[PDB]
């Protein structure tokens, strides 16, 4: 009797059994039904539990068990193109997997001498993303924003964009409707980026047990890679239903709140997850596969996903998520609704790790760029007031308008590292002062199709290399001016 | 003649901005104060 | 194997069991010389089980003996309850005679599983004009409506029935989550009036019902939709079936006070902590599968004016297509009125409708603006400053005003115009030919109350 | 004897003795078969104690044994600490060998008295604009700096440990308390790149940690640095120590998160009813007295963008010099984002720092004061209805926070421009000629991003 | 007809009552029935139709229809139309009558706020002229 | 003349001291008896009579009379005076000095606002000039 139990109280998902004497904290346990729990609370003479999944077959007076495991799920390169739950039940009908492994999913990341600074970069695709908030691997970068700003939109985009680059993806949804989520599973199966792509889903009909756990479940399943000198990138969508779940449980465990009814603990919930996506050193990666690999890094990116309410960014639970990552990429209904797509707001968005994390082009290239548009936002809000205008002004305002008309894209159109670097250089020295302000993207696309036209073999070495040379940039400068004193846009 | 009416229709719809940030701020402020007063009633009936 | 009361509080009651003979979660129990149902909600522990009681509890005492049915609420389903009117328990309320069918169906399901799901995303067809065009639907999908009287809804409501009784062959499901004894009276009659009554459901949920009536009510008609959807003809093709919610505020606002009645602690602004949870579960039953589909279409309120309040967000979570009555429109006697500029659905994108959908939609959208736009010169500073491309657009934006009215189905009793319902490729090649400035000599009267274009083109030939 | 574990809740567990062994408040135990170390906080009676774990919970159950140690934590001191990293309980995670000391210190003491006080005499140089102009520092006191998320908190105190700590002739202690832990690795790599790493101890508790190790983990700091003070040499005098503390406010954030369990009452907003004794209880420790003095700089976070927070309010008090930052400068581009209408500083009276410099500073912030009193009449309204005098104002305003910008040595990265230095005397010098009136034709884009005003004057003549 | 004096007064001895009996407060105290208390007692009046009479009386009256009017009433301060009680009430009424403050103070004696007042009802409960 | 330099953090200590002790709290987590806790402090300044102090020093003292003077301080959240604690010594108290931080960031020093700051005492305790 001393592994064994009766379940005596049943609501809202959490029972309470008497009996279970040698069960461990976060001890997993299973009942009569086939169905499992987790334990949370060992009081002096009773267990509290949530149940994982559908409590409703369960009744007072039942049976309950201890199994000696804590909460783990199956790891591999055979959970990729799959689509599986929270515990790694797959869902999409195509069979059983077959996982060699299991893996903890609570751990604690690794400390501060066993990690490695960052300066390899990641490509999303996008022109404003790339020259102004660099990603690298091994950072953590935030995607936030008002309801339908196109945040999912950008982060299938960059997982789209690691088709060549050779590194693992994983997807996470939390608190969706069924039909999303098919919708954008069809998308990346069209695309082929599902060939390297795993699925976690936990929908809006689930428990919130489950949508409280599935995140760490995803982290768990990406740090596979982490750990044997690869690299992989994990989003998570709707960081916000797990917090709002959390809520839930914390409420109806009685527990007294603090600002806008959330649990005491709420920042530790969020910094305990977000803490394992890192870069790991060689030594590390030696220690733990016991010299297989050698003289290898690991890495894991992340890309969290908040919503916000009438775009107020100085909430508690978005200022609580801004404290704890490397950045933050904010959108904006303002400009989404007039036309500018994406709407990066260039003042409110940073990238903690910097110049380092991109290539010697695109770092010579963009410096200052993000600090001389916000100074253009502040000025033109300034200069309603006036008419005397000097020349200076003037001047800023119109360079500043061409360089907000140049950061503009469609979804499902990359962009290369030539191409970016291209652009920017003909915006950096004044070559589209003369252009009409309207005619700037048509000015963009003409001269990146004649550029690749006319120049292959410069482009090609820009997109293989990305280095800065005086040879390299008289030949842009070159191209530049034979565009503009031939073809016609 | 012909300035004063276009001084008035900028005045207007920056009075008209105006309003519509303060609703917002408003707004956010009764939903606080609402949750605060809730949160202190239940404290106020836990405690007995 | 029997309980007993030992505990009586509002509409809160206390059941005592054997210990080897305790029920279920979500069971619904029988006072033995009575007429009342309790529902489980939650158990406690030593055989005791806390329940609610659906209707009044006056006269109810202490001791009395209760006994178990073993099974959730069940409600008779079937064809024959189409033209009746029941209550939440599935008891006729109208007195015409029992339900005849013996078939039932648990108001408790779990949705549908993610391999279930449709292989697309499918429109569904109205034959109004403007819908289709600005703010297309969507098989599966949840729509919101706005605006409140003196504009026309319970209308469009008759109209968005008979419609889809016409062309899809299907039928409908109405329940009402708090309604007026007046207004209901009133719509029922308006429908009898009409031959709608037997091609639509009713399930009534009044104001001066308790809570717990309140909240079920909507899982009886979401229970009779799925029926309806379910069954198949030969060759099993399925149906299309309209769930209609009087409104999902009210629906929240009965989760709340039942949440308070139960003694939760309430979390942000006075709501229940399980809000998205249970509005979640609600809506995650309507859904388009691969043997049919479910739509439903709700009422809307925003409480304070603030978009910002938890309960519209958590609705706007999941809503596809809002439409939005304004009285200005009412006003100039065009009818239905509905807001061009101001209704939006997420259906109106290149990849789902196709790029000449898009492009027209966009253009009349853009024409309307910059009309809206020169009013304001147009009747402060005069009419002379305004010529040549002003006018075109004003001619242009006055005949797209007047070209979004059509005569409807269930009004022909009244003013014997047949009714139109326009198929979707007409309403293209018609707003598409306006937009080119093809029909820039017809009058505007000719636009007027018109189902096609070739309606125009008799009217202008007659005019 | 020895004590067994009866409830686990979270990080809070209870241990039962028998009745003449209970440890005394502040003692560390020891659970049998694990690494897992607890430390008592309250005495419940009946021989059972409450403590809070310093580490996971994970494989834990009731039944366990525990051992006493009848004393406090304890960590090691003096000259073995320097070049080294601990954790909370003093033991290295650099995986280089054990400290090699054996003196010991207990974590908890209280503080010094009143009779051993000392006055600090000595002002001290930074090199950047607006804390030299505008908040002096004070050799011998505490500085604390204010902002929101992502404002620039951890950029200010790298310049500042780069320009004071580098041509320092004395030790120097570091404490993390709840940071990232990439924040860690990059300084001690930039410390180690450099010859200064045999000058500074490090202490780490980052936000990965369980509440118990960010809860104690900023007095082993402190203990380390108040033994480092009170040290003498035999013909040797005292050495200057400098402590940098990183986000106090986690503390206070650990301290809250255990309230609820250890069974106290909340209060205003959900903090626990002992905020202000706890916060006095560590801050009354770092100070300077006779025997030996103290320079610290702490960072204090404000939640939500609010500075009437309970947190930072209650810390307002415990400093000598207060630098705020705001977002709305921040978003504008100018760094640091340095608000000069809320900062202050004790040194800021003509006694100390001379007519000139107090002259020079109430005159700024008189301009600035005008200029935003100024701000709503311009926006509402146009900017020719003006007096002369506020086109003035408003002008030098402008110029004057566009001259309190400056370029980061610590921000090549970010920006890719080299860092500067700016005596305090070309700051005078360059502020008196602006307020007099001598620079009224230069173009206010020529004070952005520069050092002294030559560079303004450089800048503007090749504009 | 029937004249409802003041129901907030009503609500707040409801109020009083409730918290008495130690039921679970809710916002400002009030129980979680307050909407269950003044929407089951507006809902009482009514007109009923001829058989409904007939079936009550047992034929004693054949052709006579009944009704009842109520005149709720509800007061503000500094029109505040956004509290609990007003808003539970306003939601369940068919028209409304709105006073303001600074009308009788200025003179107006009928002081009727036409802007914000409207019947649902209309013109059919009127007259020819 | 006695001068406390802070009743806030007296209350605070006191609302720490009675949240310790399970006593039921109120508004802001305050207990009951804040009033109490300064009234019956700021109550024992005040003049007496020369019958007062030749009573109590047994005829040692003849012709005069004894005074106390109270200068309370008490600070606000953003200039937010209508707070729990500063309303019942603003009650307690005769008269009130308004310190402002516009006023003291324009170079006004000291800051005293004449507007809203009064003495209840008036001429009467004022040298004749
Ligand atoms: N660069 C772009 N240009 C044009 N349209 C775009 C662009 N990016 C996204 N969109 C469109 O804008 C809409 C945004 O949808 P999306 O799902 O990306 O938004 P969201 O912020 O994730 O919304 P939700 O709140 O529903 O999760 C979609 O219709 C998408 O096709
Ligand atoms: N002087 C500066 N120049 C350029 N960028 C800066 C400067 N100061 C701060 N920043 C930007 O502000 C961001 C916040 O910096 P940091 O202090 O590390 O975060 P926090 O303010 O949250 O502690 C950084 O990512 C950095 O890019
Ligand atoms: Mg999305
Ligand atoms: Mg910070």
């Not at chain 1, 936030?144 to 590194?167: E, H, L, P, Y």
């Not at chain 1, 200052?368 to 800023?396: H, M, P, V």
């Amino acid at each position: 009797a001393k592994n064994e139990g009766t379940i005596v109280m049943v609501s809202d998902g959490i029972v309470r059994i008497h009996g279970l004497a040698d069960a461990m904290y976060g001890e997993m346990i299973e009942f009569d039904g086939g169905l499992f729990g987790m334990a949370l609370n060992l009081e002096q003479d009773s267990v509290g539990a949530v149940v994982l999944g559908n409590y409703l077959s369960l009744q007072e007076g039942q049976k309950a068990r201890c199994t000696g495991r804590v909460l783990e799920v199956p790891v591999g390169p055979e959970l990729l193109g799959r689509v599986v739950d929270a515990l790694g039940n797959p869902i999409d009908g195509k069979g059983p997997i077959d996982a060699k492994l299991t893996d903890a999913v609570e751990k604690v990341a690794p400390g501060v001498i066993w990690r490695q600074s960052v300066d390899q970069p990641v490509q999303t695709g996008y022109k404003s993303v790339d020259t102004m908030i660099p990603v690298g691997r091994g950072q953590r970068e935030l995607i936030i924003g008002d309801r339908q700003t196109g945040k999912t939109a950008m982060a299938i985009d960059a997982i789209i964009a690691q088709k060549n680059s050779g590194i693992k993806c994983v997807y996470v949804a939390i608190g969706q409707k069924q039909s999303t989520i098919a919708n954008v599973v069809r998308k990346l199966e069209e695309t082929g980026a599902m060939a390297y792509t795993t699925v976690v889903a936990a929908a809006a009909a689930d428990p919130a047990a489950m949508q409280y756990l599935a995140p760490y479940s995803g982290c768990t399943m990406g740090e596979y890679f982490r750990d044997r000198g690869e690299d992989a990138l994990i989003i998570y969508d709707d960081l916000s239903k797990q917090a709002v779940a959390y809520r839930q449980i914390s409420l109806l465990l009685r527990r007294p709140p603090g600002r806008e009814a959330y649990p005491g603990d709420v920042f530790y919930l969020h910094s305990r997850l977000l803490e394992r996506a890192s870069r790991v050193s060689a030594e590390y990666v030696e220690k733990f596969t016991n010299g297989a690999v050698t003289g290898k890094t690991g890495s894991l990116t992340a890309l969290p996903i908040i919503e916000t309410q009438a775009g107020d960014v100085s909430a508690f639970v978005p200022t609580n998520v801004i404290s704890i990552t490397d950045g933050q990429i904010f959108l904006e209904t303002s400009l989404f609704n007039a036309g500018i797509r994406p709407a990066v707001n260039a003042g409110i968005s940073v990238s903690r790790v910097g110049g380092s994390a991109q290539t010697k082009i695109i770092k010579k290239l963009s410096g200052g760029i993000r600090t001389a548009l916000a100074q253009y936002r502040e000025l033109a809000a300034f200069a309603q007031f006036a008419s005397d205008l000097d020349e200076a002004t003037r001047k800023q305002l119109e360079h500043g308008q061409r360089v907000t008309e140049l950061m503009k894209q469609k979804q499902y159109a990359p962009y290369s590292i030539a191409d970016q670097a291209v652009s920017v250089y003909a915006s950096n020295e004044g070559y589209m002062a003369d252009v009409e302000v309207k005619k700037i993207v048509d000015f963009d696309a003409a001269l990146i199709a004649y550029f690749r036209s006319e120049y292959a073999p410069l482009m090609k070495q820009i997109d293989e290399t990305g280095d800065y040379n005086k040879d390299i940039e008289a030949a842009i400068k070159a191209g530049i001016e034979s565009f503009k004193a031939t073809q016609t846009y | 003649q012909s300035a004063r009416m276009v001084a008035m229709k900028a005045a207007t719809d920056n009075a008209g901005q105006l309003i519509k940030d303060l609703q917002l701020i408003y707004n956010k402020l009764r939903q606080a104060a609402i949750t605060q007063e809730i949160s202190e009633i239940v404290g106020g009936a836990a405690a007995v | 194997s029997s309980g007993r009361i030992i505990q009586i509080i509002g509409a809160v009651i206390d059941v005592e069991f054997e210990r080897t003979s305790v029920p279920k979660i979500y069971d619904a129990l029988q006072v033995d010389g009575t007429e009342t149902t309790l529902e489980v909600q939650q158990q406690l522990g030593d055989g005791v089980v806390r329940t609610i009681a659906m209707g009044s509890t006056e006269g109810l005492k202490r001791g009395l003996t209760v006994t178990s049915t073993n099974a959730p609420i069940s409600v008779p389903v079937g064809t024959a309850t189409l033209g009746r009117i029941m209550d939440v328990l599935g008891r006729p309320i109208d007195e015409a005679g029992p339900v005849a069918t013996e078939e039932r169906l648990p108001i408790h399901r779990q949705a549908p599983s993610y391999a279930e799901q449709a292989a697309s995303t499918d429109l569904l067809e109205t034959g109004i004009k403007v819908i289709d065009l600005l703010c297309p639907f969507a098989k599966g999908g949840k729509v919101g409506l706005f605006g409140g009287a003196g504009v026309g809804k319970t209308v469009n409501m008759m109209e968005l029935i008979n419609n889809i009784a016409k062309a899809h062959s299907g039928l409908s499901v109405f329940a009402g989550v708090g309604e007026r004894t007046r207004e209901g009276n009133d719509f029922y009659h308006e429908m009898k009036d009409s031959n709608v009554l037997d091609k639509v459901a009713m399930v009534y949920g009044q104001m001066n019902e308790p809570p717990g009536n309140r909240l079920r009510v909507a899982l009886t008609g979401l229970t009779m939709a799925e029926y309806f959807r379910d069954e198949k003809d030969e060759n099993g093709k399925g149906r299309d079936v309209l769930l209609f919610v009087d409104n999902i505020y009210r629906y929240t606002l009965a989760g709340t006070e039942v949440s308070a009645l139960l003694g939760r602690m309430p979390s942000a602004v006075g709501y229940q902590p399980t809000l998205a949870e249970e509005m979640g579960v609600l809506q995650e039953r309507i859904t388009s599968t691969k043997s049919g589909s479910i739509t439903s279409i709700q009422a809307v309120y925003v409480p304070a004016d603030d978009l910002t309040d938890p309960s519209p967000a958590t609705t706007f979570a999941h809503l596809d297509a809002t439409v939005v009555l304004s009285r200005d429109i009412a006003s100039s006697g065009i009818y239905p009125a509905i807001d061009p500029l101001d209704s939006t659905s997420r259906q109106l994108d290149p990849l789902v409708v196709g790029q000449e959908h898009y492009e027209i939609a966009r253009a009349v959208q853009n024409v309307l603006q910059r009309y809206k736009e020169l009013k304001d010169i147009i009747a402060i500073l005069g009419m002379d400053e305004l010529a040549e491309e002003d006018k075109l657009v004003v001619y242009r934006a006055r005949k797209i005003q007047r070209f979004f009215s059509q005569p409807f189905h269930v009004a022909e009793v009244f003013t014997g115009a047949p009714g139109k319902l326009v198929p979707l490729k007409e309403t293209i090649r018609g707003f598409k030919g306006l937009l080119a400035g093809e029909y820039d000599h017809i009058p505007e009267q000719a636009f007027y109350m018109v189902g096609g274009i070739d309606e125009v083109i008799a009217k202008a030939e007659k005019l």
